[PDB]
Amino acid sequence: PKATLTGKAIYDGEAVGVRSGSSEFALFQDGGSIPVYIAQDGSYSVSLFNGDYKLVRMGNAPWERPSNDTIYITVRGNTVQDIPVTPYFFVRNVSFAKNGNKITARFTINKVVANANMENVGIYLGTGILTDEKQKEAELKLGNTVSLDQENTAEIEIPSGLVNESYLYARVGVKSDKSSEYCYSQSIKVALK
């Protein structure tokens, strides 16, 4: 009778992209803690016994993690509940295109936490669906003065070990001074052939 709790880390109704194996939620009983491992597309799934639970934001996730703020989840059979998060910086309206030996990246960046300061913006190219600042075939570090709340264009060169592949995965990441993790766009497949 061990139910399934699924959902997404949500900001402005969108799943918040994160690095695979980096971000979590902790699940408690009011009456230890249960970890809730978040996938790179911001989604999560955890099998639990029926009953009421209290969820908290913690770890190294690239969003605000208040100790005091809890989310009460009542699980009676398979339950689905999205968890609202507030990223320091958010990446939206991301698109990629092959133009010669380069990948043209178009993206928008928002400063959601006024307190936070931008450290870097990166464009990543990978062989697999999991692409991030740690797993990458190529990266482009743009600095920390990228204009906000508007589209920007950047071109990353396709590396030697990816140029004869059928496709690749591309992604945009922004890192703040308030988290050890980048906040990312969705990992998007880009046709090369």
Q: How many contiguous H segments (helices) and E segments (strands) does the chain have?
A: 0, 17
Euclidean distance between CA atoms 183 and 18, whole angstroms: 5
Domain spanning 87-193: which CATH class is it, in words?
A: mainly beta
Please, what is the Cα angle at 158 between 155 and 161, to 5 degrees?
A: 160
Which residues, in sequence order, are bridge partners of residue 95? 106
CATH architecture of the domain 1-86 equals Sandwich (2.60)
Cβ neighbours of 177 (radius 10 Å): 11
- The residues of the chain that CATH labels 2.60.40.1120 are 1-86
Euclidean distance between CA atoms 155 and 148, whole angstroms: 18
- The residues of the chain that CATH labels 2.60.40.2060 are 87-193
Amino acid occupying residue 74: T
164: its two tokens: 């004869």
52: its two tokens: 């009421």
Concatenating the DSSP letter of every residue in 97-162 gives EEETTEEEEEEEEEE-STT--EEEEEEEEESSS--SSSS-SEEEE--S-PPSSSEEEEEEEPPTTT
- Asked if 39 contacts 31 with a C-beta cutoff of 8 angstroms, the reply is no
Which structural technique was applied?
X-ray
Which residues, in sequence order, are bridge partners of residue 152? 107
| Residues 6 or more apart in contact with residue 134 via CB below 8 angstroms | 19
